[PDB]
Design a protein around this ligand. Structure first.
Ligand SMILES: *[C@@H]1O[C@H](CO)[C@@H](O[C@@H]2O[C@H](CO)[C@@H](O[C@@H]3O[C@H](CO)[C@@H](O)[C@H](O)[C@@H]3O)[C@H](O)[C@H]2NC(C)=O)[C@H](O)[C@H]1NC(C)=O
Ligand SMILES: *[C@@H]1O[C@H](CO)[C@@H](O[C@@H]2O[C@H](CO)[C@@H](O)[C@H](O)[C@H]2NC(C)=O)[C@H](O)[C@H]1NC(C)=O
Ligand SMILES: *[C@@H]1O[C@H](CO)[C@@H](O[C@@H]2O[C@H](CO)[C@@H](O)[C@H](O)[C@H]2NC(C)=O)[C@H](O)[C@H]1NC(C)=O
Ligand SMILES: *[C@@H]1O[C@H](CO)[C@@H](O)[C@H](O)[C@H]1NC(C)=O
Ligand SMILES: *[C@@H]1O[C@H](CO)[C@@H](O)[C@H](O)[C@H]1NC(C)=O
Lengths: 194, 97, 244, 49
């Protein structure tokens, strides 16, 4: 989805994933990335539909003495699958010694941006033929019937003539399509009229 | 079964200057980069012509390792089709790299 | 917890044309659509479990690439399932069950009892639960714990699949009259299972176990459930004009 | 006349943009020839027919 179009779209479901990483590991929060975070902590699907937002959180997560409340995994017998979470505490063997698979970050307010804490929020968007629950701040206009108009219904845009429909829709159906995949009908989100 | 000697390279006491960059042939070894995560935080890990996620499933006839030191803001120039002091007069990658 | 000493009785039956579910969320009308994915193969060998006053048949089953699950009962004996890897306290597990009034999902590190079961509406699933990342109600569905006499009257079918950290649940309910002595057999015909729930569990699932309710005296009731495994196959689906 | 070579001045107090970065470029050759560098994949048993 283009970021410039988010204000014109509506989403059936929106999920917000939130965590803290080091500045130089924000690049790994993206599809097809390889690294300690992308492999053993948080993996996105290659067909991901959504937005990754990140910002320097030095003022809230770094301290002069150091903040050691944030942890990341260093080793997992296998790589994580998309949206998989592993919260188990286990040790791994390095040579003859057993070490914790979890390591602590040391966030110091005097460190460079690459070692500052970054708060990351991943917005996963679902766009299905279902009731809209999350929409952009677009103002609705008046319904114009029996004329060629550009239309925008819950993010779905197009050009055509809007007329009263005798078609009946299922409880959560928002739009109807034909064999050609042409949207031949829509439920008005304000009047619930097809 | 022998691990590729990446740890001894990444940890050489001194690397080469970018104008006099070093080339090392890597052969007869297993390339496992996850072993390096404990000692090396890769700010940049970008692959061209091959996906990084597929490297663990692939085998290579020849592997060359070019090593040098640059300033942080000049790491972007180590990539095909880049223009800059490093890309123009120190180290250039081929466009089909 | 409840110590169950009753033995286990199981047999092998045919899957027939059961386990068909909507492969996508795209509206398709009056069209024959081909689909390559994980489906229950037609006429496949599936495991049928039967329970009676002297037989309690619940075992840990592999999840694999997905599971077709059906219950043929008359007294709501199957209350839900446990999904996970070790199904113990070294990992998180998914507990999906009906508490009597609501279908609930819990994702925590549960130390489940050797045989997690409900004693006449009374829960005895896990000794302790911690590290809960998910706990919410999926739907309001009244399922009684009463004992109904007579033949089985309904088959409830479920398809469980894992996709992007989410457990996808497909469901269909069809009236299926089966006498207690009648041969163990699934109904004939195609019944498409509709997408019911997409639960964001974020967990790796390799094994699952069925949860049942016993009588106030901890004796097993009369019920049957079937387990089949989804396999990679191409299937052709016929949609009507409604999209069914 | 000036030297075509200039010296970097790497100070531990500088910002990340002026910190020294070690760069390693791995050039891969994939031809119809003996493999010498492979990933850590376990080999299975050969299944014939
Ligand atoms: C999902 O959970 C399963 C169940 O624990 C995980 O399976 C386990 O994976 C490890 C690593 O792949 C297996 O260990 C390996 O076994 C082979 C064969 O013995 C050995 O050559 C390797 O050196 C290593 O020890 C382990 O056997 C396996 N356990 C079982 C019971 O399947 C699986 O990795 C998890 N998937 C994730 C986290 O993505
Ligand atoms: C959204 O709100 C509008 C009102 O702003 C609802 O429409 C009005 O409903 C009242 C009561 O039925 C009617 O008298 C008005 O004529 C309607 N239109 C206007 C312009 O006021 C509308 O039903 C609401 N939609 C939903 C889905 O709740
Ligand atoms: C379904 O699979 C089971 C095995 O899981 C088959 O059962 C075995 O069949 C052989 C051959 O008849 C018997 O000798 C074994 O004693 C059976 N084992 C068990 C556990 O019953 C069964 O035949 C299969 N059914 C089919 C293929 O129709
Ligand atoms: C990383 O692990 C290797 C192998 O055990 C060890 O030689 C090396 O010193 C470790 N590096 C750090 C920074 O712990
Ligand atoms: C889930 O929430 C319900 C309602 O608060 C509670 O009774 C139950 O114990 C919780 N389960 C776990 C394992 O946290």
């Amino acid at each position: 989805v283009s970021s410039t179009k988010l204000n014109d779209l509506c989403f059936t479901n929106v999920y917000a994933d939130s965590f803290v990483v080091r500045g130089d590991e924000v690049r790994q929060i993206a599809p097809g990335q390889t690294g300690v975070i992308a492999d053993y902590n948080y993996k996105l699907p290659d067909d991901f539909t959504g937005c990754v937002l990140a910002w320097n959180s030095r003022n809230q997560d770094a301290s002069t003495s150091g903040n050691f409340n944030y942890y990341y995994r260093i080793w997992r017998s296998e790589k994580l699958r998309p949206f998989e979470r592993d919260i188990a505490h286990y040790d791994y063997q390095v040579g003859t010694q057993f070490k914790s698979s979890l390591k602590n970050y040391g966030f110091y307010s005097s460190a460079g941006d690459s070692h500052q804490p970054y708060r990351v929020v991943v917005l996963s968007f679902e766009l299905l033929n279902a009731p809209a629950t999350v929409c952009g701040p677009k103002q609705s206009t008046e319904l114009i019937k029996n004329k060629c108009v550009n239309f925008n219904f819950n993010g779905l845009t197009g050009t055509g003539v809007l007329t009263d429909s005798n078609k009946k829709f299922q409880s959560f159906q928002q739009f109807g399509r034909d064999v050609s995949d042409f949207t031949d009908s829509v439920k008005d989100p304000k009047t619930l009229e097809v | 079964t022998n691990l590729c000697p990446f740890s001894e390279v990444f940890n050489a006491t001194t690397f080469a200057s970018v104008y006099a960059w070093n080339r090392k042939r890597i052969s007869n070894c297993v390339a496992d980069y996850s072993v390096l995560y404990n000692s090396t935080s890769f700010s940049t890990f970008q692959c061209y012509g091959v996906s990084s996620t597929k490297l663990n499933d692939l085998c290579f006839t020849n592997v060359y390792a070019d090593s040098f030191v640059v300033r942080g803001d000049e790491v972007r120039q180590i990539a095909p089709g880049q223009t800059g002091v490093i890309a123009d007069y120190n180290y250039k990658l081929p466009d089909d790299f | 917890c409840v110590n169950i000493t009753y033995g286990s009785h199981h047999l092998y039956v045919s899957s027939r044309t059961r386990g068909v579910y909507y492969p996508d969320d795209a509206f398709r009308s009056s069209t024959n659509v081909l689909h390559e994915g994980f489906f229950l193969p037609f006429d496949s060998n599936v495991t049928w479990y039967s329970f009676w006053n002297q037989k309690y048949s619940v075992a840990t089953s592999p999840f694999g690439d997905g599971v077709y699950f059906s219950t043929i009962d008359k007294s709501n004996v199957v209350r839900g399932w446990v999904f996970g890897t070790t199904l113990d306290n070294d990992t998180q597990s998914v507990l999906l069950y009906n508490d009597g009034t609501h279908v609930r999902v819990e994702v925590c590190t549960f130390h489940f009892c050797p045989t997690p079961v409900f004693s006449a509406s009374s829960p005895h699933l896990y000794s302790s639960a911690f590290n809960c990342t998910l706990n919410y109600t999926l739907a309001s569905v009244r399922a009684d714990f009463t004992e109904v006499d007579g033949s089985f009257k309904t088959i409830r079918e479920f398809v469980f699949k894992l996709q992007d950290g989410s457990l996808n649940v497909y469901y269909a309910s069809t009236s299926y009259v089966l006498a207690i002595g009648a041969t163990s057999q699934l109904p004939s015909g195609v019944t498409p299972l509709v997408p019911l729930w997409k639960i964001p569990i974020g967990l790796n699932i390799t094994n699952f176990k069925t949860l049942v309710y016993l009588r106030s005296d901890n004796t097993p009731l009369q019920a049957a459930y079937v387990v089949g495994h989804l396999k990679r196959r191409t299937m052709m689906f016929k949609y009507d004009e409604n999209g069914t």
